[PDB]
Design a protein around this nucleic acid. Structure first.
Length: 497
DNA sequence: TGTCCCTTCGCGTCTCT
DNA sequence: AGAGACGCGAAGGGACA
């Protein structure tokens, strides 16, 4: 391995080799993931305790073992998991999945030991639910966040007027300790001096790097309003994503250039800045605005719309690379390429439509126009790749029309909805009398999967919202408003009677 | 060279309707 | 239904052993 010893690299490769064997049966991808983030000692630990982890009272799946191992200190996490999973499950109520979720971060050992130690007091003295304590714990630095919630939740509620839910939201990111301390410290000045509300301060603090965003907001809000004419509502919006600090500094540096030299409006710059990686997007639009409107290309409106998402930089650079071949070799129009690019993971959708537009048509019989519609949503790459896999079993075994599959895939989260449909189509039709017309109709929206899950929960185990919602009313509800429609309905019978 | 903590970027999904 | 919100993994950097 590294430069101390030599050619017992062989011993290490042999250890990696035997992990391809049973009980874990790991593939290249999984070994690579462990080596890249847990390091050699994590790889050696997995090998050493592969039987203990997979058996006994733990019963972990290989994917679960891989998730715990693939972080700094992973060997500590695997060791500690073996020690604490049973007691956390039995004595504290948590499920194994939750224990694994806590353990699957850098310093997982510390988080698991702290949850063991603090979950009781946090539930009893502070009123949190086990679920909330798990969400706090399930990030790098989780020990610190839990200890800081314990120390500061009282003052943040009583002196600064926040709710426990709010405190939990600030705490449930990496560097949660840092954000909670910064909130305790700057909340008064941000409200009193800069005119913000607590809600806004909370929104800025409820992301990774919140500390940095809050200090940056304290520091640049004045200049950005008084010198560049932005509103405080706009500044906050920039600041309310992870990386807000970076987006704010870049806005200050590029707002004059982009409005003067390139003709964008302030509200357009803000919209580009208000996403994760806002800094990256701003710089990329400035660099690529000319060429994207050069030799024809696109309208500036369209550049802004591509830029105005998480990963916007990746989308723009992918659009610049593939627009020509996609239009020319595959026959698409720009308006379609833009529509594919203007979602989260634009880059991923484009690349996938590149390698799958030719192949979904052939091996499965879809139109291009169908294929665009799939990729023109967030998660395009996931929808396409799942259509490729699951179209055959959906039509042939479950008897669905291909146009039906396509209608399910043609929404954000399509892969979820499909994978769910396949799971829940049988129990819905044959066991509860729903038609596949109705199940397709519930699946065919955003939040298809949760809607299907909620509906089956209510049917399989008749919940308390009594029989008046017959099976067609639940379908009409599930289509109209998903899981939220379903949950709101439950929450009302609970008190209106 | 491992372990812990913090910050940023990007991808994917669901809510609000 | 498009914008805005949620979650989570990868990766990189700093501190300390």
């Amino acid at each position: 391995m590294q430069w101390s010893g030599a050619r017992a690299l062989e011993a290490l490769l042999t250890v990696a080799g035997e992990l391809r064997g049973p009980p874990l049966q790991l593939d290249t991808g999984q070994l690579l993931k462990i080596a890249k983030r847990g390091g050699v000692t994590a790889v050696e630990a997995v090998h050493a305790w592969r039987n203990a982890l997979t058996g006994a009272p733990l019963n972990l799946t290989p994917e679960q073992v891989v998730a715990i191992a693939s972080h700094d200190g992973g060997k500590q996490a695997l060791e500690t998991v073996q020690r604490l999973l049973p007691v956390l499950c039995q004595a504290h109520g948590l499920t194994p999945q939750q224990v694994v979720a806590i353990a699957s971060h850098d310093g997982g050992k510390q988080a698991l030991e702290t949850v063991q130690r603090l979950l009781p007091v946090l539930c009893q003295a502070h009123g949190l639910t086990p679920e909330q304590v798990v969400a706090i714990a399930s990030h790098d630095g989780g020990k610190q966040a839990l200890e800081t919630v314990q120390a500061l939740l009282p003052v943040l509620c009583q002196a600064h007027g926040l709710t426990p839910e709010q405190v939990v939201a600030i705490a449930s990111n990496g560097g949660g300790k840092q954000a909670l301390e910064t909130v305790q410290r700057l909340l008064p000045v941000l409200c009193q001096a800069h005119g913000l509300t607590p809600q806004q301060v909370v929104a800025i603090a409820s992301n990774g790097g919140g500390k940095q965003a809050l200090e940056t907001v304290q520091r640049l809000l004045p200049v950005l309003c008084q010198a560049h004419g932005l509103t405080p509502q706009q500044v906050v919006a920039i600041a309310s994503h992870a990386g807000g600090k970076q987006a704010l500094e870049t806005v200050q540096r590029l707002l004059p250039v982009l409005c003067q030299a390139h003709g964008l409006t302030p509200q357009q710059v803000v919209a580009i800045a208000s996403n994760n990686g806002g800094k990256q997007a701003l710089e990329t639009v400035q660099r690529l605005l000319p060429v994207l409107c050069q030799a024809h290309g696109l309208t500036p409106q369209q550049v802004v719309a591509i830029a105005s998402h998480d990963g916007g930089k990746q989308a723009l650079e992918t659009v610049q690379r593939l627009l020509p071949v996609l239009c020319q070799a595959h026959g698409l129009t720009p308006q379609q390429v833009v529509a594919i690019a203007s979602n989260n993971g634009g880059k991923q959708a484009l690349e996938t439509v590149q390698r799958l537009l030719p192949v979904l048509c052939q091996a499965h019989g879809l139109t291009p126009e169908q294929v665009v519609a799939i990729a023109s949503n967030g998660g395009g790459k996931q929808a396409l790749e799942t259509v490729q896999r699951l179209l055959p079993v959906l039509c042939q075994a479950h008897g669905l029309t291909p146009e039906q599959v396509v209608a399910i895939a043609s929404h954000d989260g399509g892969k979820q909805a499909l994978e769910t449909v396949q799971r829940l189509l049988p129990v819905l039709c044959q066991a509860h009398g729903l038609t596949p017309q109705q199940v397709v109709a519930i699946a065919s929206n955003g939040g298809g999967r949760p809607a299907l899950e909620s509906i089956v929960a209510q049917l399989s185990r008749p919940d308390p919202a009594l029989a008046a919602l017959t099976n067609d009313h639940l379908v009409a509800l599930a289509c109209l408003g998903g899981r939220p429609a379903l949950d709101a309905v439950k929450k009302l019978e609970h008190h209106h009677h």
